[PDB]
Motif scaffolding. Structure first.
Motif, PDB file in Angstrom:
ATOM      1  N   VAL I   4       0.842  -1.200   0.000  1.00  0.00           N
ATOM      2  CA  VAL I   4       0.000   0.000   0.000  1.00  0.00           C
ATOM      3  C   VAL I   4       0.873   1.244   0.000  1.00  0.00           C
ATOM      4  CG1 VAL I   4      -1.712  -1.268   1.387  1.00  0.00           C
ATOM      5  CG2 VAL I   4      -0.112   0.320   2.499  1.00  0.00           C
ATOM      6  N   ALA I   5       0.348   2.344  -0.497  1.00  0.00           N
ATOM      7  CA  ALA I   5       1.062   3.589  -0.523  1.00  0.00           C
ATOM      8  C   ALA I   5       0.104   4.744  -0.276  1.00  0.00           C
ATOM      9  CB  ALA I   5       1.774   3.760  -1.822  1.00  0.00           C
ATOM     10  N   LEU I   6       0.501   5.728   0.505  1.00  0.00           N
ATOM     11  CA  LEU I   6      -0.365   6.865   0.718  1.00  0.00           C
ATOM     12  C   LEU I   6       0.371   8.179   0.865  1.00  0.00           C
ATOM     13  CD1 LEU I   6      -0.104   6.834   3.874  1.00  0.00           C
ATOM     14  CD2 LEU I   6      -1.931   5.278   3.823  1.00  0.00           C
ATOM     15  N   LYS I   7      -0.297   9.251   0.506  1.00  0.00           N
ATOM     16  CA  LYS I   7       0.210  10.594   0.655  1.00  0.00           C
ATOM     17  C   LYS I   7      -0.206  11.116   2.026  1.00  0.00           C
ATOM     18  CE  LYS I   7       0.080  13.549  -2.498  1.00  0.00           C
ATOM     19  NZ  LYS I   7       0.325  14.507  -3.621  1.00  0.00           N
ATOM     20  N   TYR I   8       0.647  11.911   2.646  1.00  0.00           N
ATOM     21  CA  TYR I   8       0.387  12.547   3.928  1.00  0.00           C
ATOM     22  C   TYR I   8       0.963  13.906   3.765  1.00  0.00           C
ATOM     23  CZ  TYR I   8       5.146  11.695   5.391  1.00  0.00           C
ATOM     24  OH  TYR I   8       6.489  11.669   5.460  1.00  0.00           O
ATOM     25  N   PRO I   9       0.612  14.854   4.603  1.00  0.00           N
ATOM     26  CA  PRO I   9       1.106  16.204   4.361  1.00  0.00           C
ATOM     27  C   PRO I   9       2.598  16.256   4.461  1.00  0.00           C
ATOM     28  CG  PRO I   9      -0.686  16.225   5.837  1.00  0.00           C
ATOM     29  CD  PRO I   9      -0.329  14.828   5.724  1.00  0.00           C
ATOM     30  N   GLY I  10       3.204  16.615   3.346  1.00  0.00           N
ATOM     31  CA  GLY I  10       4.637  16.621   3.172  1.00  0.00           C
ATOM     32  C   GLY I  10       5.356  15.335   2.798  1.00  0.00           C
ATOM     33  N   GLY I  11       4.676  14.233   2.573  1.00  0.00           N
ATOM     34  CA  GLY I  11       5.368  13.012   2.246  1.00  0.00           C
ATOM     35  C   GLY I  11       4.558  11.841   1.755  1.00  0.00           C
ATOM     36  N   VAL I  12       5.209  10.709   1.597  1.00  0.00           N
ATOM     37  CA  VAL I  12       4.541   9.498   1.195  1.00  0.00           C
ATOM     38  C   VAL I  12       4.998   8.332   2.027  1.00  0.00           C
ATOM     39  CG1 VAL I  12       4.077  10.124  -1.152  1.00  0.00           C
ATOM     40  CG2 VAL I  12       6.259   9.201  -0.582  1.00  0.00           C
ATOM     41  N   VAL I  13       4.139   7.362   2.234  1.00  0.00           N
ATOM     42  CA  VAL I  13       4.515   6.169   2.926  1.00  0.00           C
ATOM     43  C   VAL I  13       4.135   4.946   2.105  1.00  0.00           C
ATOM     44  CG1 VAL I  13       2.518   5.961   4.350  1.00  0.00           C
ATOM     45  CG2 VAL I  13       4.511   4.920   5.060  1.00  0.00           C
ATOM     46  N   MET I  14       5.014   3.959   2.057  1.00  0.00           N
ATOM     47  CA  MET I  14       4.718   2.741   1.333  1.00  0.00           C
ATOM     48  C   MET I  14       5.080   1.606   2.255  1.00  0.00           C
ATOM     49  SD  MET I  14       6.124   1.187  -2.315  1.00  0.00           S
ATOM     50  CE  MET I  14       5.180   2.184  -3.396  1.00  0.00           C
ATOM     51  N   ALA I  15       4.194   0.633   2.369  1.00  0.00           N
ATOM     52  CA  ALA I  15       4.430  -0.499   3.235  1.00  0.00           C
ATOM     53  C   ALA I  15       3.944  -1.774   2.568  1.00  0.00           C
ATOM     54  CB  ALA I  15       3.700  -0.301   4.533  1.00  0.00           C
ATOM     55  N   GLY I  16       4.589  -2.894   2.877  1.00  0.00           N
ATOM     56  CA  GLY I  16       4.188  -4.159   2.296  1.00  0.00           C
ATOM     57  C   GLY I  16       4.284  -5.286   3.299  1.00  0.00           C
ATOM     58  N   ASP I  17       3.569  -6.380   3.030  1.00  0.00           N
ATOM     59  CA  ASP I  17       3.572  -7.560   3.873  1.00  0.00           C
ATOM     60  C   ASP I  17       4.809  -8.425   3.596  1.00  0.00           C
ATOM     61  OD1 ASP I  17       2.098 -10.467   2.642  1.00  0.00           O
ATOM     62  OD2 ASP I  17       2.552  -8.769   1.314  1.00  0.00           O
ATOM     63  N   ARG I  18       4.931  -9.541   4.298  1.00  0.00           N
ATOM     64  CA  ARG I  18       6.123 -10.374   4.206  1.00  0.00           C
ATOM     65  C   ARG I  18       5.896 -11.790   3.694  1.00  0.00           C
ATOM     66  NH1 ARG I  18       9.577  -8.000   7.847  1.00  0.00           N
ATOM     67  NH2 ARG I  18      11.170  -9.018   6.536  1.00  0.00           N
ATOM     68  N   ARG I  19       4.674 -12.088   3.271  1.00  0.00           N
ATOM     69  CA  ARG I  19       4.386 -13.437   2.856  1.00  0.00           C
ATOM     70  C   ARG I  19       4.769 -13.810   1.428  1.00  0.00           C
ATOM     71  NH1 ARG I  19      -0.830 -16.340   5.096  1.00  0.00           N
ATOM     72  NH2 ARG I  19       0.660 -16.200   6.834  1.00  0.00           N
ATOM     73  N   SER I  20       5.015 -15.095   1.264  1.00  0.00           N
ATOM     74  CA  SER I  20       5.357 -15.664  -0.018  1.00  0.00           C
ATOM     75  C   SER I  20       4.598 -16.985  -0.097  1.00  0.00           C
ATOM     76  CB  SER I  20       6.866 -15.892  -0.072  1.00  0.00           C
ATOM     77  OG  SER I  20       7.220 -16.717  -1.137  1.00  0.00           O
ATOM     78  N   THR I  21       3.983 -17.260  -1.243  1.00  0.00           N
ATOM     79  CA  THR I  21       3.244 -18.517  -1.376  1.00  0.00           C
ATOM     80  C   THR I  21       3.537 -19.300  -2.651  1.00  0.00           C
ATOM     81  OG1 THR I  21       1.278 -17.286  -2.201  1.00  0.00           O
ATOM     82  CG2 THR I  21       1.225 -18.019   0.122  1.00  0.00           C
ATOM     83  N   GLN I  22       3.272 -20.595  -2.531  1.00  0.00           N
ATOM     84  CA  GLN I  22       3.422 -21.567  -3.593  1.00  0.00           C
ATOM     85  C   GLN I  22       2.085 -22.287  -3.500  1.00  0.00           C
ATOM     86  OE1 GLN I  22       6.005 -21.907  -5.836  1.00  0.00           O
ATOM     87  NE2 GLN I  22       4.378 -23.178  -6.722  1.00  0.00           N
ATOM     88  N   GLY I  23       1.090 -21.799  -4.243  1.00  0.00           N
ATOM     89  CA  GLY I  23      -0.240 -22.365  -4.157  1.00  0.00           C
ATOM     90  C   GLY I  23      -0.793 -21.992  -2.779  1.00  0.00           C
ATOM     91  N   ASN I  24      -1.194 -23.010  -2.031  1.00  0.00           N
ATOM     92  CA  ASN I  24      -1.724 -22.800  -0.693  1.00  0.00           C
ATOM     93  C   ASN I  24      -0.613 -22.800   0.360  1.00  0.00           C
ATOM     94  OD1 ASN I  24      -4.911 -24.518  -0.962  1.00  0.00           O
ATOM     95  ND2 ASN I  24      -4.397 -22.336  -1.077  1.00  0.00           N
ATOM     96  N   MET I  25       0.570 -23.273  -0.017  1.00  0.00           N
ATOM     97  CA  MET I  25       1.656 -23.354   0.937  1.00  0.00           C
ATOM     98  C   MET I  25       2.360 -22.038   1.171  1.00  0.00           C
ATOM     99  SD  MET I  25       3.255 -26.994  -0.093  1.00  0.00           S
ATOM    100  CE  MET I  25       3.666 -26.409  -1.789  1.00  0.00           C
ATOM    101  N   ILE I  26       2.653 -21.765   2.437  1.00  0.00           N
ATOM    102  CA  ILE I  26       3.359 -20.546   2.801  1.00  0.00           C
ATOM    103  C   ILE I  26       4.825 -20.875   2.550  1.00  0.00           C
ATOM    104  CG2 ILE I  26       4.011 -19.081   4.747  1.00  0.00           C
ATOM    105  CD1 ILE I  26       1.179 -19.674   5.857  1.00  0.00           C
ATOM    106  N   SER I  27       5.463 -20.144   1.653  1.00  0.00           N
ATOM    107  CA  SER I  27       6.841 -20.459   1.341  1.00  0.00           C
ATOM    108  C   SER I  27       7.826 -19.415   1.857  1.00  0.00           C
ATOM    109  CB  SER I  27       6.981 -20.659  -0.181  1.00  0.00           C
ATOM    110  OG  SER I  27       6.563 -19.517  -0.901  1.00  0.00           O
ATOM    111  N   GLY I  28       7.313 -18.311   2.378  1.00  0.00           N
ATOM    112  CA  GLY I  28       8.179 -17.276   2.893  1.00  0.00           C
ATOM    113  C   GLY I  28       7.440 -16.507   3.963  1.00  0.00           C
TER     114      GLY I  28
END
Lengths: 222, 222, 222, 222, 229, 222, 222, 222, 229
Positions: I4-28
């Protein structure tokens, strides 16, 4: 093909073009696509001619069959349902190129407000029906052009006369943009056909009336 | 689309309709399909519009290119060969829906006998050409109708005016039977276009003359 | 194949060619394609021979079956409907190469005006029928050519004799452009067959009369 | 199409029909299928017209190109090999509907005995060639009928004139059984074309001579 | 395979070859393809052997079945119709590689003119039938060759023997151009079979006449070959 | 097609039939399938005629090309390898219906023992070769029949004439069971061709010799 | 389409949009998607209109049918099961483009705690059902957007009126992101429809209330 | 998407909506689809966004590139040709889902008459172009609706402001029927964009002017 | 995945999750999906991991390559264009299963007004780009849930810390409805990653502020769930 239907206070008018095609070839110039189904109902069908004709013929028989059997006519809702059933029944064949879509117009004798008794019902290939609330509807390869035309001309429909006149202009606009829809043929004297329905029942509009309207429209655009 | 070409004493005339389609929808009403390629040649192309236009344009440039380079025009046979090569080159694209077919008409200045100098050449999708020996030819979705019409009307051709008249009537017949060919539009004042070629060169036929012929044909069938 | 049918004041004439093909090979030289179905009706069928013949045979039996059972002949509309039902019932097989299209011609005894009692009905592969209002119709691989020919010759139709002549010339034009339609064979003396129907019933036209018309058409074109 | 070739003492004769087809439709009535390739050779090509014409044209250029370059004509065997290479090169195109099969006829100036200098060579789609040793050969959709006819008529060939007559009768028989091959057109005066080759070279047979032969064949069958 | 049939004054003759093939391989040398269906009818069938044989057998039984049941033979038109129905019924199987096409020949005892009472009827895979008016017809992989041969030889047919001869010559011509059709086998003494039908009924032609005819054609062919080039 | 090769004391003999087919139709009756490749080698090729002929032609040119260039003939092994390479190179085309299979026969002048300097090499579609050690081999649609025949007739080969006789009888048996292989044609005087190779080189067998053997075989079976 | 349902203390509210589409074209503006099935149950169906309507109609009939027959209404669980069975029965048709998914909302009169008698049941295409325990649910092409909206607004639902406001805002948010869901039409005065159900039964919400709420939501976002 | 262009005396106006979609999802609410290409030209592109933007950007560079290089702007015809070539070049991609269609509007300073100088050019997916002669044109998923709207409103265009008003109303009509075209967004204050071009050059229309016209159109429809 | 990414007064923030998948399996469980591309730009990429990583890496190199070569950074528009070109080039590979979609966030030093100089650009599979004007955007299999969450929460973004909190809450909502997006892992101490960019440049957000915010969200949701029903 283009079949249009519009509501006016106290009734409905339904009108259709006369063309038939086989690919790019004109195969018919005088096909009648609007049928008086019973005293207060008219059906217009687009698509595969063989199927369209069969539908209108079977449908009318079914409606009269019920009337004679039960001594009274089917309610308008019943009429819709029966038509819907027939359409649904042809779905398999429609998928294979035997598609036919009807447009239903009628005057409901049991409706509380008589000037508002006019009914227009459209159908999709699966038999889904919809009672039109905006005044007009159209079916066939030129239906979008007709509907867009009626959208701008509908305010003029104040009675069954101006309604018939508008209907004819919508069909004219349809033929102006859809090669599969036939415009008025002045050389041969062939014009769209139309049915009007009010409290006194369904009646075929005289060809001479439609021809007069047609010539006026042509003079106007000229 | 329908483009026709015919031979009359001392000349050739080529005429085409003005319609353009996208399926059943009319997408054009005033397309010009007959081009004066050089002083003694005219080309009419049917099929995919984009390709048809490109062909006529390229073809005329190639003919003029040769003349400027070699100081003398290409022989009529050379002109035919160049056009045939262009069509053959487009065959793969034609197979994929980009088909364009031309019809060639001209006056051969080097012909032995002048009343006989008019030339008409038709082409198939593979570039195969044929110099017509029976007096007339047509190309497009309405060509069979036009040819069947000219077959019965050709004996009336005795000069430019009658040749022109027969050409216009053939187009009229084509439009009558083929929704993809446009008939004369009296409301908008749009008529088929035409080119006449004789010993004095290729000249565009004035709209006024063509319109007079169209009205007479119409009045005649009425 | 080409089968034609036309209306003349007081009646109808239907004529057909005699060729049969297997690809490019001529497999028949004297096939009879026009049958007298009952005293006032004639059927001409194009397409797959096996199916065409079966249709005509079965159809005639069905019409006479009704007559004997009910003591009276079927109305003309009933006849049309029965034929349409038969065609529609062959739609699956036809999709598979067993396609057969009939052309119906008749004189309606119950019609109010005798001069106009002649009837011509065409059918599409789905059983869709159409009562021709323009005077003539045709079916088969040469039908377009024949119809375009009749369009320009129809105004000469004033009685059965000029009708029959226009019919033979239309078949001649069809053979001239469709290799699958057989022209008059002067060497073997084989000519198109024809049936004429008027108030006095359906009658086979004598070969000698057709032979005379054919030869005249030929000498004329020569 | 049907193209025939036969040996008579001291020469060869090759003759072809004039028809052109697009499915069942007759698209050409006067196509010339037999070409004089060089002074002692003639080529007849069947199949896709566009390709057939290109082949004859290119082939003749290649033969003359060698002659001018090397000062002497190619040996007959070399001529055969060049034609076969051309056919093999078109094999992929042929598989997609661009097939052209040639038939080669000639008089060999380097043959030891002159009444035996005549040559006929047939080719298959892969370029395989065969020097005919039985006197005649044919190519095209009507070749079986023509060959079966010549088989029974060959014994009558005793010179150029009778050879030319048997060739024309073979073409006639081909047209009699193959709708894609055109028989003599008496109405329009269009007849098969032919080339005769002997020690004095290849010469086009005059139309008047073939027309007489054609008429006599017709009188005889009648 | 090639089966021919022709009309001669007062009669009809039908003759067939003896070959059977499995691809390129010759699988039969003495197959009999022409059957006497009833006293005045003969059937010759081409195509898939197993089907061809079933057809002839069933058809004959059906014709005789009617006769016994109704006390009178079917009219010639009825016979035609029954055979056409049988062919149509096999249309699906035919598409799957079980195609069989028959050729019918007969003498109509009820026709008007006895010199012209002979009948020849051809059938297409859909059961479409056609009564021939030119005197001859043929069916099978060599039929085109046989018909073009008969076209040039038909004017020599002035009676049963010359008709039989022309038929045999047409089969010979078919074998000459169609490897699937068997020519006369002089080494084994196997020849085409033939049935002749006239007012006195259908009869099998004796091998001996056919064998003589075949040698005569061959000798003629040799002579003519040597005379020409 | 059937081509046979067998070893006899002091040499080899190779013989082939004369038939050509296009499906079930006989398209050739005098095709020569056995070629003398060089002074001590003969090639027989089966399959697609066009390719078979090209192979034999190209192969002989290759062998002679080496000889002229290097002053000495290629060893027998080298000849084999060069043929195998040619076959392998055609694998893709063969997979597409252009398959050609050769059979090679030769006399190795460089072999140790001249009584068996005879060589017979077979090849498969991928170019795989095998030097036959059992005395005979065959290729083509009738090869199985010919080989089973030779297996029983080989003990009878004691010299060239008896080998030639066995070869001809093998071809006769092949034609007896394979419709695609041509038997001796007594009416036209066409017989299998043959080449014999021994210490003094490859020689074409005279037709008269083969005709005598053929007639003797036929007499014996009768 | 988007249909939402949510529980409020003492009842449930279900609301749906009014749009109908045919690809990108708007084909309906006033469709009613929420039906009162019986006195304490409402059904909302998304997907193929024809099937959705049939379901609601058939379902209501089946519920009343049971009641009349057995003298007592079906338990809520029975109602669920019947609806699931109906969906499961349409699985083959759904796989072919006839998919319809219902959303069920009701008040269970036989529940223990009346303040918790509200029920919301969702269904998947195989007829799998799930009694929602989190307070709200939605179905249709805009259901994700609506559910994410309700997740943030649900805590505001303290009674029927705030429940209704949240429902309308969820539909508004669905239309804001899904072109197939129709937002409030202020020009035409068309608004989402809704049904509220509590101990006193199912009741249609008055259009005027919804329009008020919709205008407040829009003013809010302005 | 819908982009419209029209002629008013002395000028052209082009306007487009702001919507972007990913299937049913709205993916953009402020996309600018009409670009000022040069001082006297504006381009509007529909279809795949990525390709649409690239086209407008590349096109404007190519036109400015020519000008700088040659010191003079490209003639209007040259501009058309360049854009057509770009569209043709994208055909392989268009067939795979990357189809983008342009609509060109401009003022031609070298036109014979200043009032009639305005130009509107439409293009098909093969690069076929057409100079509109009827006054208006549109492109995009809502172009049919917009064209049918303009057909009825064009007579009201008497100047630059009435032309901009009809343009905005046409876009409004398009949004009313095509869910993929965005109507005016009063809550967010987002409106269609537009460019007007006259003898003084191309200028962006101020949002405020469009916003007034839009609210007025909306007030009217209420 | 959800970024996700958003504007705030004077800046921007971008953040992301940490998951990785192979089908239904959590691989990361600890993949880092948000990269600082240059001093004023951040990129987050969703889709096929292999391709996503290559893109970020190549993109950053391309941006710095230009800077060193030309002595000045690429304009923000140029950066967008270069990224869009990279995406379009992968179009054929994407059709085959190697689809990667980036989300771009930056601070334009040359923008006129510093309070709104933040930038957010989204891209579709064909390389079509869009400069977001409503304040926020998201990409990945949970992007719809995250965007619908931010819609309701955006009015709370008044500064860098509240922007970041809305961003973590949006990712938390995405994880709640999308099994392919990973929520905060309290047992392992793994949390979304984030980058903040303002006039002073792009900076990584410290794990600790993000872990506090995530626990706070969880405490909030838990209270709310107990209060409701």
């Amino acid at each position: 093909t283009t079949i249009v239907a519009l509501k006016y206070p106290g009734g409905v008018v339904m009108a259709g073009d006369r063309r038939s095609t086989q690919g790019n070839m004109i195969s018919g110039r005088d096909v009648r696509k609007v049928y008086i189904t019973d005293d207060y109902t008219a059906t217009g069908i687009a698509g595969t001619a063989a199927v369209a004709v069969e539908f209108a013929r079977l449908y009318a028989v079914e409606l009269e069959h019920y009337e004679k059997l039960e001594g009274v006519p089917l309610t308008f809702a019943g009429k819709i349902n029966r038509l819907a059933i027939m359409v649904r029944g042809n779905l398999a064949a429609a998928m294979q190129g035997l598609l036919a879509l009807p447009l239903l117009a009628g005057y409901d004798i049991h409706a509380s407000d008589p000037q508002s008794a006019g009914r227009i019902v459209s159908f999709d290939a699966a038999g889904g029906w919809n009672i039109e609330e905006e005044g007009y509807q159209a079916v066939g390869s030129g239906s979008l052009f007709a509907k867009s035309s009626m959208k701008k001309l509908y305010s003029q429909v104040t009675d069954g006369d101006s309604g018939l006149r508008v209907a004819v202009e919508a069909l004219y606009d349809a033929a102006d943009d859809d090669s599969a829809t036939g415009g008025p043929d002045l050389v041969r004297g062939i014009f769209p056909t139309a049915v009007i329905i009010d409290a006194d029942g369904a009646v075929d509009v005289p060809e001479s009336r439609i021809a007069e309207l047609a010539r006026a429209i042509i003079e106007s655009r000229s």
